Amino acid sequence: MEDEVVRFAKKMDKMVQKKNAAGALDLLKELKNIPMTLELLQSTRIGMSVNAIRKQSTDEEVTSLAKSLIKSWKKLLDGPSTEKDLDEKKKEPAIT
Hints:
The protein is mainly alpha-helical. Helices cover about 70% and strands about 0% of the residues. The protein is globular, with a radius of gyration of 13 Å.
């Protein structure tokens, strides 16, 4: 359900805007129990929302969870070498 996933992303964005660390954590836990495909991640960049939460989060477990999510994404990509040595794209320090 892409529409449902989009709603979760929208809700996640609201949590980021409200800076609700607890809400974000609960959503992250839910994401851990709900499997996502690489295509879903590519179409829905929920990782960006998680990364945004990481920037506004000083909780180590939240940052660790975000890192785990990205590593999981890389495992799904099955090409961590290019992501790790990603230099074909310009990485911005912050996303406005």
